[PDB]
Amino acid sequence: SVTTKRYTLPPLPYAYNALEPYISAEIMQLHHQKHHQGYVNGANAALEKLEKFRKGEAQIDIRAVLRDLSFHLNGHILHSIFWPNMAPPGKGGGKPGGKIADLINKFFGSFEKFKEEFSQAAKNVEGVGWAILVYEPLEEQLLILQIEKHNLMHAADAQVLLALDVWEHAYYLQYKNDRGSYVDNWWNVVNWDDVERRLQKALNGQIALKL
Amino acid sequence: SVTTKRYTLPPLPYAYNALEPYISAEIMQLHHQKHHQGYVNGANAALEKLEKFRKGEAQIDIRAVLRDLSFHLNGHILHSIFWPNMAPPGKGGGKPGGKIADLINKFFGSFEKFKEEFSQAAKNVEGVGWAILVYEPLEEQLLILQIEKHNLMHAADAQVLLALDVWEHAYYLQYKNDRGSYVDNWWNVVNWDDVERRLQKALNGQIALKL
Amino acid sequence: SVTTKRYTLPPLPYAYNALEPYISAEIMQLHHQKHHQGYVNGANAALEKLEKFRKGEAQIDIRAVLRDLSFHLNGHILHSIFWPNMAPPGKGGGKPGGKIADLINKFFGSFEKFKEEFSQAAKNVEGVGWAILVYEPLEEQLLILQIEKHNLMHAADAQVLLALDVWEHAYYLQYKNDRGSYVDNWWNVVNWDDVERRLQKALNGQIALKL
Amino acid sequence: SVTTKRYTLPPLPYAYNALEPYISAEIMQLHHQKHHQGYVNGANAALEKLEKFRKGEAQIDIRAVLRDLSFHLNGHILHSIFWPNMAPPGKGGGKPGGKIADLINKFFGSFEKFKEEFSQAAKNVEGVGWAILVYEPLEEQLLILQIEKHNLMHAADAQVLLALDVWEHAYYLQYKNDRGSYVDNWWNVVNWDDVERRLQKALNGQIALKL
């Protein structure tokens, strides 16, 4: 009668040390195996409370549980995008070509200016959060957003094409307090094929999470 | 070399008095003409700052503007979905039908369990916000979420199918502090024909807009 | 043994129509009997869950209950300060004198500038919240702060001297969406004797409550 | 003429290695020199913008700057309390005594229970934040609260007695993702005599700073 779909941790698209020297192998493991894994569990934990409520098996503090859901569900959605959003230098890094390159110049004027806006947004996230590029469906335009925690300030219905995680656990062991150096080096592992992939879908008015 | 798409206030699908005595014509007028117009304006003002920045004609407080943009943009998107999510009683109200009646019963067990979860999320919003129903694309399931202000707690990439505004200006003039009764009466105007259309687009792997 | 002190709704320092034509009696009535009461209620409810928890008598989602407590407790504290912060025209309105007038000139240049900063802080709160003037103990200076909801952005240890509620239920019935007109008119009922007493307590290194 | 009072980084009460093995000297150094210095700097940076606005020397995005001031000011105040809140094993650690130990039993029943409520609040702060024990003046009782970032959820006028920093930079280099071990190991350096004195102030209806 009542059914909820559960989440699972996606395997990384590469080896934990594949992004070195930009992101340490130890961070990659902790980030993937501990942090991302925790969001998957948190999402299911909240979903199970909701199912128990829906089955009439228990009451519920809907505000608390839905806050839990949003936080965890987003941590998971964003980390799922983050991993394939990167790749070993070669497949990753460099300048973008294709539609993503076109649209970037169109809305930002140049790749460099796009990097400035995105990198500055990432470096200036207050507390933990992300810097992301989304395709805005309503008026069809690229927009860079700052995200606090994992769920604050997303554009309703918008599709995340590229995300940069600036939660301290995403860089501290390697870069320490120097988030800025992390943000700058990260450009060396960005997978534009992945981003172009998602842009291809969003451009057609599609959701661009899978593939 | 740099462009930013602007937003405009969408026309209501009906007269202001269309939802009475569920939502007064005064509230409908203010909410739309004043409040919603404000969000369109705020979003555009933020873009103007970004456009200037991207052109190099000016600097920018990226955190400030991205926080601004996120707020107003969501205010605009959610209200644009909010209006067609309702209709003059007869065309609005009743119960769900179609793929949405099927999914609601699938994930919640019944329409009454759904109405209970959604209504409680709405009534239990802390401060000003919304109670929404979205299609979650990663595990393809329907979820109800609480949104604080206009931009807090959205699920990245998810498609908003049904939105219920619980900001005081959506009900106070009529129901005063009784947000609970505002919530209960609201179901008598829900345009389930609109929600179904949105779910159909969502299921096609499309964005729940422009349809 | 375990005991928690509970909160109670304090009486207004004047009748429900004492602030007209600046704040209608209906607003004052609702805001006091319904809203403020709701916060007192919320704080005690949260404390009853904590007490049960401390008596080993129950379990607890510490994040959910402490989030509830902080919001409601601040709602109560701020409203408790808000009522005596005003007074029927005569005792309220005009410019400040005594120490507060002095400190205001010292830190803002003049009362006119202060009122500018304060009104703009209040007119620009995003969503519901407050504009508050506090005495910063650490470095001894006046500061105006924006508060979102009742608990977001307060300065640790600081003493609230003057509070202006910009939640819609504090002005909507009369000013509708013109919060600005509301804020401008609010200066006519500001009980500067109250502000002064609180500042003097702060200056004394004391908590600015109870007179 | 307007003046603002600037903030300065306070020296630690002990050597950087003075709290090992519980908190590494690298953390202490980075935490103090980079992070705390950043908040003081950020607080002052906001004051500079506020100062010229008051001197009619420029315009101001009041929401932007007051949001900035709240975050940085709180970071400075809370860290300023955080440092003396700890002490090298000997002067720090063990259980409380005097008034604080006595009050912890009144409101929590036992030190054991208090430790559970405080530990659970700190381990369960969503994102980055603090767990704090304050003295709530209005009804005169000990309350534990969760703080997100440095400025969300504080209780107006409340005096912070003991603060625990759970921002990842406060532990990640040593404890990695295990916030739980960090929280548990921290008690071993708590300066109960400090919490005692601040409680004395609060009990004296005074502000708990500069002593």
From Swiss-Prot, chains A, B, C, D:
Q: Which PROSITE patterns match?
A: SOD_MN (PS00088)
**Binding residues for Fe cation:** H31, H79, D165, H169
According to its UniProt record, which reaction does this protein catalyse? 2 superoxide + 2 H(+) = H2O2 + O2
Known cofactor(s): Fe cation
* Pfam families in alphabetical order: Sod_Fe_C, Sod_Fe_N
EC numbers? 1.15.1.1
Top-rank taxon: Archaea
Q: Quote the record's cofactor note.
A: Binds 1 Fe cation per subunit.
Q: What class of enzyme is it?
A: oxidoreductase
UniProt KW keywords:
Iron, Metal-binding, Oxidoreductase
The answer to whether the entry has keyword Iron is yes
Molecular functions per Gene Ontology:
metal ion binding; superoxide dismutase activity
Entries under InterPro entries matching the protein: Fe/Mn_Superoxide_Dismutase (IPR050265), Mn/Fe_SOD (IPR001189), Mn/Fe_SOD_BS (IPR019833), Mn/Fe_SOD_C (IPR019832), Mn/Fe_SOD_N (IPR019831), Mn/Fe_SOD_N_sf (IPR036324), SOD_C_sf (IPR036314)
User: What are the coiled-coil residue ranges?
Assistant: none
Check the record and name the PANTHER family matching this protein: SUPEROXIDE DISMUTASE 2, SUPEROXIDE DISMUTASE [MN], MITOCHONDRIAL
The job of this chain, per UniProt, is described as: Destroys superoxide anion radicals which are normally produced within the cells and which are toxic to biological systems.
Q: Which family is this protein grouped under?
A: Belongs to the iron/manganese superoxide dismutase family.
- Quaternary structure note: Homotetramer.
**Protein name (record):** Superoxide dismutase [Fe]
Its source organism is Pyrobaculum aerophilum (strain ATCC 51768 / DSM 7523 / JCM 9630 / CIP 104966 / NBRC 100827 / IM2)
